[PDB]
């Protein structure tokens, strides 16, 4: 068969928005508080994560159907899927070779240890890399990666969503464009769609673990003072 | 006459603490979010001011009598004198030549315009420089500059101080060490002490104006998100 207009249009919007909010050169990383290899890497990663959040918001506002949801649902979805969308979009810079996120020279090429200096442990960093690898190997098309994020951000099963019915609907309309795309445009994606949906489940475990480690961190004022106002707002819990 | 032991000891504590919290090389400025000449200078100055606050706290904890005050008074004094202590200690890098704070190369040598890119106007920046100049000309001794800050931080007339009686007392004991020092150790300080006390009054006008401009700034989330958790805490109003 083949994709329809509304379906293909959703793809053009999503793919154009991802391009509008992601730079494969990472030219804005020089404006971050420099990295340092006592949580020496905290300042830089807080800025990296604060920066990403803004980019995910710019991307989210362009997902078809998001703008319509109420301000509270837009916020509920972002606040609970942010960390996961960041992990997904961060894969673009991950390298199965060095097993690290290569965003720049020795300076911006982050290893697992570098994130340990941010306050995280292997209990999170280990599965994270495993997920990063398992995902990289799926050599997704730009249209499948972009759809996967849009789908991850439209989970009606997020702590805080009230109109969990329309959010549920928008996500099904997207899982369709994806399933139809893998089946029509992706040679060899017979098992793909399922593996992609599975990656979404691994993100819950990751999103969960991070939440615990971050809660610990944020409780210590000497460390929370290193974070940015945005990070503190998205990851903090406020009705 | 001459100074006493307790008096001279206060001077040694104050002078040693200022040295312990101020670096005439500004080596930590590279760890700030880089400057940019839409409030392009905001990120860098927020980090410069956040950094200073920590230094003023380290200095304040070493002022004789401060540690004894209650946690609320220590906080009340800091929260309302912070901006003023920063303006005072910032004079050390001010230069009557270029009329700017020279902390580094063309990068860290701040002009009046650079602070305008932080969200401030001449209505504040103008008197600030006038104060910076008027103060620089007083060629104060390191012991008079350090005492002046300790005195400025022990004003019992701050919005929030409850034990405004002991704070009043500690400030008088310091104005003494200063008056006795100018009179015994500073050749030509016949009018000095008065000019110094006057600089404290100019700081109220400055501290006041800044407070208005900053309140405006902090009310706009697009700008407050550029500030640091510490800055937002010291300059925000919370009982």
């Amino acid at each position: 068969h083949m994709l329809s207009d509304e379906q293909m249009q959703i793809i053009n919007s999503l793919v154009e928005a991802h391009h509008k909010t992601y730079d494969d050169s990472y030219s804005d990383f020089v404006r971050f508080r420099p990295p340092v290899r006592r949580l020496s890497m905290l300042p830089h990663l807080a800025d990296l994560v604060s920066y990403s959040i803004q980019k995910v918001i710019g991307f989210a506002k362009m997902i078809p159907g998001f703008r319509d949801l109420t301000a509270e649902d837009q916020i509920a979805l972002l606040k609970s899927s942010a960390i996961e969308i960041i992990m997904l979009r961060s894969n673009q810079s991950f390298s199965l070779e060095d097993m690290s996120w290569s965003c720049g020279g020795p300076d911006f090429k982050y290893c697992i240890n570098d994130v340990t200096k941010a306050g995280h442990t292997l209990e999170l960093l280990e599965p994270l890399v495993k997920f990063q690898v398992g995902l990289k190997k799926l050599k997704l098309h730009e249209e499948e990666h972009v759809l996967l994020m849009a789908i991850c951000l439209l989970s009606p099963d997020r702590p805080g969503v009230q109109d969990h019915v329309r959010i549920e609907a928008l996500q099904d309309r997207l899982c369709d464009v994806l399933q139809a795309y893998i089946r029509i445009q992706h040679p060899g994606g017979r098992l793909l769609y399922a593996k992609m949906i599975q990656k979404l489940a691994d993100l819950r475990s990751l999103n969960e673990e991070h939440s615990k480690q971050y809660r610990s961190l944020s409780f210590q004022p000497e460390h929370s003072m290193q974070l940015t106002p945005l990070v503190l707002e998205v990851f903090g819990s406020e009705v | 006459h001459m100074l006493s032991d307790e008096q001279m000891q206060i001077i040694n504590s104050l002078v040693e603490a200022h040295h312990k919290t101020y670096d005439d090389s500004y080596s930590d400025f590279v760890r700030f979010r880089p400057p940019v000449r839409r409030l392009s200078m905001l990120p860098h100055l927020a980090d410069l001011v956040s950094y200073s606050i920590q230094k003023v706290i380290g200095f304040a904890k070493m002022i004789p009598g401060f540690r004894d005050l209650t946690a609320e008074d220590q906080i009340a004094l800091l929260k309302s004198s912070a901006i003023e202590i920063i303006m005072l200690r910032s004079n050390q890098s001010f230069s009557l030549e270029d009329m700017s704070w020279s902390c580094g190369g063309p990068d860290f040598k701040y002009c009046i315009n650079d602070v305008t890119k932080a969200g401030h106007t001449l209505e504040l920046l103008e008197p600030l420089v006038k104060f910076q100049v008027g103060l620089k000309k007083l060629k104060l001794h390191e012991e008079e500059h350090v005492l002046l800050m300790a005195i400025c931080l022990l004003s019992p007339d701050r919005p929030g101080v409850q034990d405004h009686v002991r704070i009043e007392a500690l400030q008088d004991r310091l104005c003494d060490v200063l008056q006795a020092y100018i009179r015994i150790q500073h050749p030509g300080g016949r009018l000095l002490y008065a000019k110094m006390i006057q600089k404290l009054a100019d700081l109220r006008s400055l501290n006041e104006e800044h407070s208005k401009q900053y309140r405006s700034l902090s009310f706009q989330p697009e700008h407050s998100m550029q500030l640091t958790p510490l800055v937002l805490e010291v300059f925000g109003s919370e009982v």
Binding site: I57, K61, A71, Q74, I75, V234 | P221, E222
Partner: peptide, 10 residues
Amino acid sequence: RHKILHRLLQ
């Protein structure tokens, strides 16, 4: 509350 977020969601 969520000042910043509300603002960024333009």
